[PDB]
């Protein structure tokens, strides 16, 4: 099972400046619950966005996708194609925009957090992938975060 997990503003922005322009503590617990114990695949930029102290994420098989021949990610496996990173019973692609887009054709599930924040799309932003008609998703109820923002969860799936 290959899944994609991300948090977006309603506008689809997921990253900017090598960072995420909000904080949603509930989503961090939700992200950790979904990915805990499994393989996580991420782009090399996303891997660089994590501080060295949190790298690699605990309890998960961290894999970093890069075109650099002998790129070294201390604590993670480095592969040159996504397919090499996808060989586990359960794999979660955790970003970024480039790797979500590359990974979607191999994905059966998407766990999407939508953050009710008026964040306009900006040139150079990392964006969430657009899900077509083949994706059947369940919309969650609006939830209020300890951070003061409103959000809701989407669980998409295709057969
Ligand atoms: N849930 C979220 O909101 C969320 C989750 C994660 C990340 N983000 C944000 O996403 C942003 C970064 O996403 P990004 O799209 O800018 O960069 P990225 O997708 O995280 O990783 C980009 C890198 O992936 C590697 N790559 C891309 N296609 C490849 C391929 N076909 N084969 C091998 N390697 C490949 C390249 O690494 P080389 O340059 O080494 O070739 C490329 O530089 C950051 O702002 C981060 O905070 C948000
Ligand atoms: N600290 C931290 C920052 C960003 C991520 C993300 F999944 F978005 F890549 C995970 C963690 N654990
Ligand atoms: Co699990
Ligand atoms: Co299924």
Tab-separated table of N, CA and C and ligand atoms in Angstrom:
chain	number	residue	atom	x	y	z
A	1	UNK	N	0.832	-1.205	0.000
A	1	UNK	CA	0.000	0.000	0.000
A	1	UNK	C	0.867	1.255	0.000
A	2	UNK	N	0.690	2.104	-1.009
A	2	UNK	CA	1.418	3.362	-1.115
A	2	UNK	C	0.436	4.510	-0.892
A	3	UNK	N	0.694	5.304	0.138
A	3	UNK	CA	-0.167	6.410	0.489
A	3	UNK	C	0.572	7.728	0.429
A	4	UNK	N	-0.183	8.821	0.343
A	4	UNK	CA	0.355	10.176	0.348
A	4	UNK	C	-0.285	10.932	1.497
A	5	UNK	N	0.526	11.650	2.261
A	5	UNK	CA	0.018	12.368	3.417
A	5	UNK	C	0.555	13.788	3.356
A	6	UNK	N	-0.348	14.761	3.435
A	6	UNK	CA	0.076	16.151	3.394
A	6	UNK	C	-0.968	17.016	4.078
A	7	UNK	N	-0.552	18.236	4.392
A	7	UNK	CA	-1.417	19.271	4.932
A	7	UNK	C	-1.387	20.447	3.972
A	8	UNK	N	-2.550	20.947	3.602
A	8	UNK	CA	-2.582	22.074	2.689
A	8	UNK	C	-3.485	23.165	3.232
A	9	UNK	N	-3.135	24.401	2.913
A	9	UNK	CA	-4.143	25.438	2.913
A	9	UNK	C	-5.197	25.084	1.865
A	10	UNK	N	-6.378	25.696	1.992
A	10	UNK	CA	-7.436	25.491	1.000
A	10	UNK	C	-6.941	25.758	-0.425
A	11	UNK	N	-5.998	26.688	-0.580
A	11	UNK	CA	-5.496	27.046	-1.903
A	11	UNK	C	-4.570	25.999	-2.490
A	12	UNK	N	-4.130	25.017	-1.685
A	12	UNK	CA	-3.287	23.929	-2.141
A	12	UNK	C	-1.817	24.097	-1.825
A	13	UNK	N	-1.421	25.265	-1.318
A	13	UNK	CA	-0.050	25.481	-0.885
A	13	UNK	C	0.296	24.511	0.238
A	14	UNK	N	1.424	23.815	0.094
A	14	UNK	CA	1.915	22.930	1.145
A	14	UNK	C	3.273	23.349	1.691
A	15	UNK	N	4.075	24.084	0.934
A	15	UNK	CA	5.357	24.541	1.435
A	15	UNK	C	5.733	25.863	0.805
A	16	UNK	N	6.596	26.599	1.502
A	16	UNK	CA	7.094	27.867	0.984
A	16	UNK	C	8.365	28.214	1.750
A	17	UNK	N	9.420	28.560	1.021
A	17	UNK	CA	10.690	28.891	1.649
A	17	UNK	C	11.373	27.739	2.356
A	18	UNK	N	11.147	26.512	1.902
A	18	UNK	CA	11.682	25.370	2.608
A	18	UNK	C	11.013	25.107	3.932
A	19	UNK	N	9.795	25.604	4.113
A	19	UNK	CA	9.101	25.536	5.387
A	19	UNK	C	7.615	25.402	5.095
A	20	UNK	N	6.853	25.160	6.151
A	20	UNK	CA	5.395	25.168	6.094
A	20	UNK	C	4.915	26.413	6.782
A	21	UNK	N	4.148	27.295	6.112
A	21	UNK	CA	3.787	28.593	6.693
A	21	UNK	C	2.588	28.552	7.634
A	22	UNK	N	2.551	27.550	8.509
A	22	UNK	CA	1.588	27.477	9.598
A	22	UNK	C	2.062	26.392	10.559
A	23	UNK	N	1.371	26.288	11.692
A	23	UNK	CA	1.581	25.216	12.659
A	23	UNK	C	0.235	24.655	13.071
A	24	UNK	N	0.111	23.333	13.015
A	24	UNK	CA	-1.111	22.621	13.374
A	24	UNK	C	-0.719	21.431	14.241
A	25	UNK	N	-0.644	21.618	15.563
A	25	UNK	CA	-0.108	20.544	16.420
A	25	UNK	C	-0.905	19.263	16.322
A	26	UNK	N	-2.214	19.370	16.113
A	26	UNK	CA	-3.025	18.169	15.969
A	26	UNK	C	-2.585	17.369	14.762
A	27	UNK	N	-2.229	18.058	13.686
A	27	UNK	CA	-1.835	17.363	12.474
A	27	UNK	C	-0.521	16.619	12.669
A	28	UNK	N	0.381	17.159	13.488
A	28	UNK	CA	1.645	16.478	13.756
A	28	UNK	C	1.416	15.135	14.443
A	29	UNK	N	0.476	15.089	15.388
A	29	UNK	CA	0.113	13.825	16.014
A	29	UNK	C	-0.573	12.902	15.022
A	30	UNK	N	-1.404	13.463	14.140
A	30	UNK	CA	-2.096	12.654	13.148
A	30	UNK	C	-1.122	12.118	12.114
A	31	UNK	N	-0.173	12.950	11.711
A	31	UNK	CA	0.869	12.520	10.792
A	31	UNK	C	1.707	11.410	11.408
A	32	UNK	N	2.029	11.547	12.687
A	32	UNK	CA	2.913	10.574	13.299
A	32	UNK	C	2.192	9.251	13.489
A	33	UNK	N	0.891	9.298	13.782
A	33	UNK	CA	0.119	8.069	13.938
A	33	UNK	C	0.026	7.304	12.628
A	34	UNK	N	-0.173	8.015	11.519
A	34	UNK	CA	-0.359	7.344	10.236
A	34	UNK	C	0.946	6.746	9.734
A	35	UNK	N	2.052	7.459	9.900
A	35	UNK	CA	3.309	7.012	9.327
A	35	UNK	C	4.117	6.133	10.264
A	36	UNK	N	3.856	6.190	11.567
A	36	UNK	CA	4.639	5.439	12.549
A	36	UNK	C	4.757	3.963	12.178
A	37	UNK	N	5.989	3.453	12.181
A	37	UNK	CA	6.246	2.051	11.965
A	37	UNK	C	6.482	1.656	10.520
A	38	UNK	N	6.209	2.546	9.576
A	38	UNK	CA	6.227	2.199	8.168
A	38	UNK	C	7.381	2.884	7.472
A	39	UNK	N	7.457	2.664	6.167
A	39	UNK	CA	8.425	3.370	5.343
A	39	UNK	C	7.878	4.743	4.987
A	40	UNK	N	8.727	5.760	5.087
A	40	UNK	CA	8.380	7.104	4.644
A	40	UNK	C	9.355	7.527	3.551
A	41	UNK	N	8.808	7.996	2.439
A	41	UNK	CA	9.580	8.473	1.301
A	41	UNK	C	9.433	9.983	1.235
A	42	UNK	N	10.551	10.679	1.041
A	42	UNK	CA	10.520	12.127	0.944
A	42	UNK	C	11.547	12.608	-0.070
A	43	UNK	N	11.255	13.764	-0.666
A	43	UNK	CA	12.223	14.417	-1.505
A	43	UNK	C	13.355	15.020	-0.711
A	44	UNK	N	14.470	15.212	-1.408
A	44	UNK	CA	15.697	15.633	-0.749
A	44	UNK	C	15.527	17.018	-0.133
A	45	UNK	N	14.774	17.909	-0.796
A	45	UNK	CA	14.464	19.211	-0.199
A	45	UNK	C	13.696	19.051	1.104
A	46	UNK	N	12.656	18.213	1.103
A	46	UNK	CA	11.920	17.980	2.340
A	46	UNK	C	12.838	17.426	3.426
A	47	UNK	N	13.752	16.512	3.071
A	47	UNK	CA	14.671	15.968	4.075
A	47	UNK	C	15.555	17.059	4.653
A	48	UNK	N	16.003	17.992	3.810
A	48	UNK	CA	16.778	19.132	4.292
A	48	UNK	C	15.956	20.073	5.166
A	49	UNK	N	14.626	20.071	5.031
A	49	UNK	CA	13.784	20.965	5.822
A	49	UNK	C	13.652	20.514	7.271
A	50	UNK	N	13.868	19.230	7.549
A	50	UNK	CA	13.866	18.729	8.921
A	50	UNK	C	15.187	19.057	9.611
A	51	UNK	N	15.164	19.595	10.838
A	51	UNK	CA	16.418	19.823	11.573
A	51	UNK	C	17.189	18.529	11.778
A	52	UNK	N	18.516	18.604	11.932
A	52	UNK	CA	19.295	17.378	12.094
A	52	UNK	C	18.854	16.584	13.317
A	53	UNK	N	18.300	17.261	14.327
A	53	UNK	CA	17.908	16.592	15.563
A	53	UNK	C	16.667	15.725	15.395
A	54	UNK	N	15.810	16.028	14.420
A	54	UNK	CA	14.641	15.206	14.165
A	54	UNK	C	14.869	14.215	13.032
A	55	UNK	N	16.051	14.221	12.434
A	55	UNK	CA	16.372	13.334	11.329
A	55	UNK	C	17.161	12.137	11.827
A	56	UNK	N	16.715	10.912	11.490
A	56	UNK	CA	15.489	10.637	10.744
A	56	UNK	C	14.284	10.569	11.689
A	57	UNK	N	13.070	10.613	11.161
A	57	UNK	CA	11.904	10.536	12.022
A	57	UNK	C	11.877	9.169	12.722
A	58	UNK	N	11.676	9.144	14.047
A	58	UNK	CA	11.815	7.877	14.799
A	58	UNK	C	10.758	6.845	14.451
A	59	UNK	N	11.166	5.573	14.488
A	59	UNK	CA	10.242	4.463	14.341
A	59	UNK	C	9.785	4.226	12.929
A	60	UNK	N	10.388	4.899	11.962
A	60	UNK	CA	10.018	4.762	10.570
A	60	UNK	C	11.274	4.548	9.740
A	61	UNK	N	11.105	3.825	8.638
A	61	UNK	CA	12.162	3.628	7.655
A	61	UNK	C	12.182	4.860	6.759
A	62	UNK	N	13.142	5.756	7.015
A	62	UNK	CA	13.278	7.009	6.280
A	62	UNK	C	14.007	6.752	4.966
A	63	UNK	N	13.385	7.141	3.855
A	63	UNK	CA	13.996	7.049	2.536
A	63	UNK	C	13.943	8.422	1.893
A	64	UNK	N	15.063	8.850	1.305
A	64	UNK	CA	15.178	10.149	0.657
A	64	UNK	C	15.420	9.933	-0.831
A	65	UNK	N	14.652	10.636	-1.657
A	65	UNK	CA	14.731	10.528	-3.109
A	65	UNK	C	15.557	11.687	-3.664
A	66	UNK	N	16.611	11.372	-4.422
A	66	UNK	CA	17.486	12.413	-4.956
A	66	UNK	C	18.102	11.981	-6.281
A	67	UNK	N	18.459	12.978	-7.097
A	67	UNK	CA	19.182	12.729	-8.338
A	67	UNK	C	20.690	12.753	-8.150
A	68	UNK	N	21.170	13.317	-7.043
A	68	UNK	CA	22.592	13.302	-6.741
A	68	UNK	C	23.070	11.868	-6.610
A	69	UNK	N	24.164	11.550	-7.310
A	69	UNK	CA	24.628	10.167	-7.407
A	69	UNK	C	24.826	9.556	-6.027
A	70	UNK	N	25.745	10.117	-5.250
A	70	UNK	CA	26.072	9.575	-3.941
A	70	UNK	C	25.631	10.514	-2.827
A	71	UNK	N	24.482	11.168	-3.004
A	71	UNK	CA	23.931	11.970	-1.924
A	71	UNK	C	23.814	11.124	-0.667
A	72	UNK	N	24.283	11.672	0.442
A	72	UNK	CA	24.228	10.996	1.727
A	72	UNK	C	23.232	11.708	2.630
A	73	UNK	N	22.288	10.947	3.169
A	73	UNK	CA	21.338	11.428	4.167
A	73	UNK	C	21.585	10.590	5.413
A	74	UNK	N	22.394	11.106	6.339
A	74	UNK	CA	22.705	10.352	7.549
A	74	UNK	C	21.423	9.946	8.247
A	75	UNK	N	21.222	8.634	8.379
A	75	UNK	CA	20.058	8.087	9.039
A	75	UNK	C	18.973	7.583	8.111
A	76	UNK	N	19.070	7.850	6.812
A	76	UNK	CA	18.056	7.436	5.856
A	76	UNK	C	18.711	6.736	4.674
A	77	UNK	N	17.908	5.944	3.969
A	77	UNK	CA	18.320	5.398	2.686
A	77	UNK	C	18.138	6.443	1.598
A	78	UNK	N	19.071	6.480	0.654
A	78	UNK	CA	18.998	7.390	-0.482
A	78	UNK	C	18.831	6.557	-1.744
A	79	UNK	N	17.773	6.833	-2.498
A	79	UNK	CA	17.485	6.131	-3.737
A	79	UNK	C	17.342	7.155	-4.859
A	80	UNK	N	17.470	6.672	-6.091
A	80	UNK	CA	17.497	7.557	-7.238
A	80	UNK	C	16.202	7.566	-8.018
A	81	UNK	N	15.357	6.579	-7.770
A	81	UNK	CA	14.035	6.527	-8.369
A	81	UNK	C	13.030	6.203	-7.280
A	82	UNK	N	11.819	6.737	-7.440
A	82	UNK	CA	10.770	6.499	-6.453
A	82	UNK	C	10.482	5.008	-6.290
A	83	UNK	N	10.462	4.266	-7.398
A	83	UNK	CA	10.112	2.850	-7.347
A	83	UNK	C	11.039	2.071	-6.428
A	84	UNK	N	12.313	2.463	-6.358
A	84	UNK	CA	13.225	1.814	-5.422
A	84	UNK	C	12.799	2.025	-3.978
A	85	UNK	N	12.198	3.181	-3.684
A	85	UNK	CA	11.776	3.507	-2.331
A	85	UNK	C	10.460	2.842	-1.973
A	86	UNK	N	9.680	2.464	-2.986
A	86	UNK	CA	8.403	1.777	-2.811
A	86	UNK	C	8.626	0.272	-2.888
A	87	UNK	N	9.045	-0.309	-1.762
A	87	UNK	CA	8.961	-1.763	-1.623
A	87	UNK	C	8.912	-2.086	-0.119
A	88	UNK	N	7.706	-1.955	0.415
A	88	UNK	CA	7.351	-2.219	1.797
A	88	UNK	C	5.855	-2.505	1.812
A	89	UNK	N	5.342	-3.244	2.803
A	89	UNK	CA	3.883	-3.473	2.856
A	89	UNK	C	3.090	-2.183	2.902
A	90	UNK	N	3.642	-1.165	3.549
A	90	UNK	CA	2.966	0.112	3.697
A	90	UNK	C	4.011	1.209	3.609
A	91	UNK	N	3.875	2.063	2.600
A	91	UNK	CA	4.789	3.167	2.372
A	91	UNK	C	3.989	4.456	2.329
A	92	UNK	N	4.495	5.495	2.990
A	92	UNK	CA	3.844	6.800	2.989
A	92	UNK	C	4.798	7.829	2.408
A	93	UNK	N	4.344	8.547	1.383
A	93	UNK	CA	5.126	9.615	0.770
A	93	UNK	C	4.797	10.904	1.506
A	94	UNK	N	5.814	11.541	2.084
A	94	UNK	CA	5.563	12.648	2.990
A	94	UNK	C	5.991	13.986	2.393
A	95	UNK	N	6.112	14.076	1.072
A	95	UNK	CA	6.463	15.323	0.415
A	95	UNK	C	7.831	15.296	-0.220
A	96	UNK	N	8.217	16.374	-0.899
A	96	UNK	CA	7.382	17.553	-1.016
A	96	UNK	C	6.525	17.564	-2.258
A	97	UNK	N	6.245	18.774	-2.746
A	97	UNK	CA	5.395	18.919	-3.915
A	97	UNK	C	5.878	18.098	-5.092
A	98	UNK	N	7.184	18.125	-5.359
A	98	UNK	CA	7.701	17.348	-6.483
A	98	UNK	C	7.474	15.852	-6.280
A	99	UNK	N	7.649	15.360	-5.051
A	99	UNK	CA	7.559	13.918	-4.843
A	99	UNK	C	6.106	13.460	-4.739
A	100	UNK	N	5.209	14.280	-4.172
A	100	UNK	CA	3.785	13.944	-4.230
A	100	UNK	C	3.338	13.756	-5.666
A	101	UNK	N	3.708	14.692	-6.539
A	101	UNK	CA	3.302	14.604	-7.935
A	101	UNK	C	3.871	13.356	-8.587
A	102	UNK	N	5.150	13.080	-8.349
A	102	UNK	CA	5.765	11.883	-8.914
A	102	UNK	C	5.114	10.610	-8.387
A	103	UNK	N	4.641	10.636	-7.138
A	103	UNK	CA	4.190	9.428	-6.455
A	103	UNK	C	2.715	9.105	-6.671
A	104	UNK	N	1.884	10.101	-6.958
A	104	UNK	CA	0.440	9.895	-7.069
A	104	UNK	C	0.021	8.726	-7.966
A	105	UNK	N	0.626	8.495	-9.135
A	105	UNK	CA	0.184	7.356	-9.967
A	105	UNK	C	0.388	5.993	-9.332
A	106	UNK	N	1.207	5.887	-8.293
A	106	UNK	CA	1.440	4.626	-7.612
A	106	UNK	C	0.700	4.555	-6.288
A	107	UNK	N	-0.143	5.538	-5.998
A	107	UNK	CA	-0.770	5.653	-4.696
A	107	UNK	C	-2.196	5.141	-4.748
A	108	UNK	N	-2.601	4.466	-3.680
A	108	UNK	CA	-3.986	4.063	-3.536
A	108	UNK	C	-4.739	4.901	-2.519
A	109	UNK	N	-4.033	5.588	-1.616
A	109	UNK	CA	-4.653	6.396	-0.574
A	109	UNK	C	-3.986	7.760	-0.492
A	110	UNK	N	-4.750	8.733	-0.014
A	110	UNK	CA	-4.247	10.059	0.321
A	110	UNK	C	-4.913	10.473	1.619
A	111	UNK	N	-4.116	10.900	2.586
A	111	UNK	CA	-4.629	11.479	3.818
A	111	UNK	C	-4.283	12.959	3.759
A	112	UNK	N	-5.308	13.802	3.668
A	112	UNK	CA	-5.157	15.229	3.418
A	112	UNK	C	-5.709	16.005	4.608
A	113	UNK	N	-4.871	16.850	5.198
A	113	UNK	CA	-5.305	17.890	6.113
A	113	UNK	C	-5.482	19.199	5.340
A	114	UNK	N	-6.650	19.810	5.467
A	114	UNK	CA	-6.911	21.102	4.854
A	114	UNK	C	-7.025	22.127	5.968
A	115	UNK	N	-6.211	23.172	5.893
A	115	UNK	CA	-6.130	24.186	6.938
A	115	UNK	C	-6.891	25.428	6.476
A	116	UNK	N	-7.942	25.800	7.212
A	116	UNK	CA	-8.784	26.925	6.809
A	116	UNK	C	-8.034	28.216	7.096
A	117	UNK	N	-7.164	28.554	6.162
A	117	UNK	CA	-6.276	29.697	6.271
A	117	UNK	C	-6.203	30.327	4.886
A	118	UNK	N	-6.275	31.645	4.832
A	118	UNK	CA	-6.343	32.299	3.541
A	118	UNK	C	-4.966	32.509	2.961
A	119	UNK	N	-4.329	31.426	2.524
A	119	UNK	CA	-2.964	31.481	2.030
A	119	UNK	C	-2.983	31.447	0.514
A	120	UNK	N	-2.751	32.572	-0.151
A	120	UNK	CA	-2.772	32.591	-1.613
A	120	UNK	C	-1.568	31.884	-2.202
A	121	UNK	N	-1.796	31.237	-3.346
A	121	UNK	CA	-0.719	30.607	-4.095
A	121	UNK	C	0.270	31.665	-4.566
A	122	UNK	N	1.557	31.396	-4.366
A	122	UNK	CA	2.620	32.329	-4.698
A	122	UNK	C	3.633	31.631	-5.592
A	123	UNK	N	4.240	32.396	-6.496
A	123	UNK	CA	5.222	31.825	-7.407
A	123	UNK	C	6.335	31.157	-6.613
A	124	UNK	N	6.661	29.920	-6.989
A	124	UNK	CA	7.648	29.143	-6.274
A	124	UNK	C	7.121	28.351	-5.095
A	125	UNK	N	5.840	28.468	-4.763
A	125	UNK	CA	5.304	27.643	-3.692
A	125	UNK	C	5.294	26.174	-4.087
A	126	UNK	N	5.493	25.316	-3.094
A	126	UNK	CA	5.187	23.908	-3.267
A	126	UNK	C	3.681	23.722	-3.134
A	127	UNK	N	3.102	22.936	-4.048
A	127	UNK	CA	1.659	22.762	-4.126
A	127	UNK	C	1.281	21.302	-3.949
A	128	UNK	N	0.097	21.084	-3.387
A	128	UNK	CA	-0.452	19.752	-3.310
A	128	UNK	C	-0.821	19.249	-4.702
A	129	UNK	N	-0.807	17.933	-4.911
A	129	UNK	CA	-1.315	17.392	-6.177
A	129	UNK	C	-2.824	17.560	-6.272
A	130	UNK	N	-3.301	17.665	-7.501
A	130	UNK	CA	-4.733	17.742	-7.746
A	130	UNK	C	-5.254	16.331	-7.970
A	131	UNK	N	-6.308	15.980	-7.241
A	131	UNK	CA	-6.916	14.658	-7.290
A	131	UNK	C	-8.094	14.668	-8.259
A	132	UNK	N	-8.038	13.798	-9.268
A	132	UNK	CA	-9.054	13.759	-10.316
A	132	UNK	C	-10.345	13.068	-9.878
A	133	UNK	N	-11.052	12.459	-10.841
A	133	UNK	CA	-12.294	11.742	-10.565
A	133	UNK	C	-12.059	10.321	-10.078
A	134	UNK	N	-10.871	9.763	-10.315
A	134	UNK	CA	-10.608	8.419	-9.827
A	134	UNK	C	-10.487	8.360	-8.306
A	135	UNK	N	-10.391	9.501	-7.624
A	135	UNK	CA	-10.234	9.540	-6.174
A	135	UNK	C	-11.591	9.701	-5.493
A	136	UNK	N	-11.939	8.753	-4.631
A	136	UNK	CA	-13.158	8.814	-3.828
A	136	UNK	C	-12.754	9.090	-2.383
A	137	UNK	N	-13.122	10.263	-1.875
A	137	UNK	CA	-12.679	10.696	-0.562
A	137	UNK	C	-13.821	10.993	0.386
A	138	UNK	N	-13.559	10.788	1.677
A	138	UNK	CA	-14.501	11.103	2.741
A	138	UNK	C	-14.094	12.413	3.399
A	139	UNK	N	-15.027	13.368	3.446
A	139	UNK	CA	-14.776	14.685	4.022
A	139	UNK	C	-15.003	14.652	5.528
A	140	UNK	N	-14.066	15.212	6.267
A	140	UNK	CA	-14.197	15.260	7.702
A	140	UNK	C	-14.873	16.532	8.173
A	141	UNK	N	-15.272	16.517	9.441
A	141	UNK	CA	-15.862	17.690	10.062
A	141	UNK	C	-14.786	18.726	10.351
A	142	UNK	N	-15.185	19.995	10.343
A	142	UNK	CA	-14.271	21.051	10.753
A	142	UNK	C	-13.866	20.863	12.209
A	143	UNK	N	-12.592	21.122	12.493
A	143	UNK	CA	-11.996	20.942	13.806
A	143	UNK	C	-11.163	22.169	14.131
A	144	UNK	N	-11.173	22.578	15.394
A	144	UNK	CA	-10.431	23.758	15.812
A	144	UNK	C	-9.133	23.340	16.488
A	145	UNK	N	-8.032	23.877	15.983
A	145	UNK	CA	-6.716	23.526	16.465
A	145	UNK	C	-6.339	24.370	17.673
A	146	UNK	N	-5.541	23.765	18.564
A	146	UNK	CA	-4.911	24.481	19.666
A	146	UNK	C	-4.166	25.706	19.191
A	147	UNK	N	-3.756	25.737	17.919
A	147	UNK	CA	-3.029	26.866	17.345
A	147	UNK	C	-3.941	28.016	16.945
A	148	UNK	N	-5.253	27.805	16.965
A	148	UNK	CA	-6.200	28.841	16.622
A	148	UNK	C	-6.736	28.761	15.214
A	149	UNK	N	-6.251	27.816	14.413
A	149	UNK	CA	-6.714	27.630	13.047
A	149	UNK	C	-7.737	26.503	12.982
A	150	UNK	N	-8.599	26.584	11.981
A	150	UNK	CA	-9.596	25.568	11.707
A	150	UNK	C	-9.090	24.650	10.599
A	151	UNK	N	-9.392	23.364	10.716
A	151	UNK	CA	-8.913	22.404	9.736
A	151	UNK	C	-9.921	21.275	9.634
A	152	UNK	N	-9.724	20.426	8.631
A	152	UNK	CA	-10.512	19.210	8.495
A	152	UNK	C	-9.672	18.182	7.749
A	153	UNK	N	-9.975	16.910	7.976
A	153	UNK	CA	-9.239	15.801	7.387
A	153	UNK	C	-10.006	15.212	6.214
A	154	UNK	N	-9.269	14.850	5.172
A	154	UNK	CA	-9.810	14.143	4.022
A	154	UNK	C	-9.099	12.802	3.909
A	155	UNK	N	-9.866	11.739	3.722
A	155	UNK	CA	-9.317	10.406	3.491
A	155	UNK	C	-9.744	9.965	2.090
A	156	UNK	N	-8.829	10.066	1.123
A	156	UNK	CA	-9.074	9.666	-0.258
A	156	UNK	C	-8.530	8.266	-0.511
A	157	UNK	N	-9.162	7.578	-1.455
A	157	UNK	CA	-8.863	6.188	-1.768
A	157	UNK	C	-9.317	5.942	-3.199
A	158	UNK	N	-8.624	5.042	-3.892
A	158	UNK	CA	-9.110	4.559	-5.177
A	158	UNK	C	-8.834	3.064	-5.298
A	159	UNK	N	-9.679	2.395	-6.082
A	159	UNK	CA	-9.604	0.953	-6.280
A	159	UNK	C	-9.171	0.695	-7.720
B	1	LIG	N1	2.512	18.382	4.375
B	1	LIG	C1	3.214	19.468	3.955
B	1	LIG	O1	2.662	20.575	3.959
B	1	LIG	C2	4.567	19.230	3.528
B	1	LIG	C3	5.196	17.895	3.658
B	1	LIG	C4	6.599	17.887	3.184
B	1	LIG	C5	7.187	18.962	2.666
B	1	LIG	N2	6.507	20.181	2.556
B	1	LIG	C6	7.153	21.333	1.951
B	1	LIG	O2	7.458	21.002	0.630
B	1	LIG	C7	8.542	21.868	0.223
B	1	LIG	C8	9.562	21.065	-0.566
B	1	LIG	O3	8.854	20.352	-1.544
B	1	LIG	P1	9.707	20.500	-3.090
B	1	LIG	O4	8.657	20.033	-4.072
B	1	LIG	O5	10.114	21.919	-3.029
B	1	LIG	O6	11.053	19.596	-3.024
B	1	LIG	P2	10.794	17.966	-2.629
B	1	LIG	O7	9.760	17.489	-3.593
B	1	LIG	O8	10.614	17.838	-1.141
B	1	LIG	O9	12.157	17.189	-3.003
B	1	LIG	C9	12.626	17.803	-4.164
B	1	LIG	C10	13.809	16.954	-4.552
B	1	LIG	O10	13.352	15.662	-4.796
B	1	LIG	C11	14.320	15.068	-5.638
B	1	LIG	N3	13.634	14.510	-6.778
B	1	LIG	C12	12.535	15.030	-7.473
B	1	LIG	N4	12.145	14.240	-8.490
B	1	LIG	C13	13.046	13.158	-8.438
B	1	LIG	C14	13.174	12.008	-9.222
B	1	LIG	N5	12.311	11.795	-10.263
B	1	LIG	N6	14.144	11.074	-8.978
B	1	LIG	C15	14.970	11.363	-7.926
B	1	LIG	N7	14.974	12.408	-7.085
B	1	LIG	C16	13.972	13.314	-7.376
B	1	LIG	C17	15.354	16.182	-6.037
B	1	LIG	O11	16.327	16.083	-5.162
B	1	LIG	P3	17.957	16.506	-5.792
B	1	LIG	O12	17.722	17.983	-5.848
B	1	LIG	O13	18.858	15.966	-4.677
B	1	LIG	O14	17.912	15.741	-7.087
B	1	LIG	C18	14.499	17.420	-5.825
B	1	LIG	O15	15.365	18.481	-5.540
B	1	LIG	C19	9.172	22.449	1.529
B	1	LIG	O16	8.729	23.780	1.645
B	1	LIG	C20	8.533	21.572	2.602
B	1	LIG	O17	8.318	22.245	3.796
B	1	LIG	C21	5.215	20.296	3.008
B	2	LIG	N1	9.220	18.060	12.225
B	2	LIG	C1	8.651	17.715	10.939
B	2	LIG	C2	8.573	18.665	9.935
B	2	LIG	C3	8.011	18.322	8.709
B	2	LIG	C4	7.534	17.037	8.480
B	2	LIG	C5	6.915	16.668	7.126
B	2	LIG	F1	6.223	15.501	7.252
B	2	LIG	F2	6.050	17.660	6.762
B	2	LIG	F3	7.873	16.511	6.158
B	2	LIG	C6	7.611	16.088	9.495
B	2	LIG	C7	8.171	16.436	10.719
B	2	LIG	N2	8.246	15.454	11.776
B	3	LIG	CO1	0.051	2.176	10.338
B	4	LIG	CO1	-8.186	-0.175	-1.312
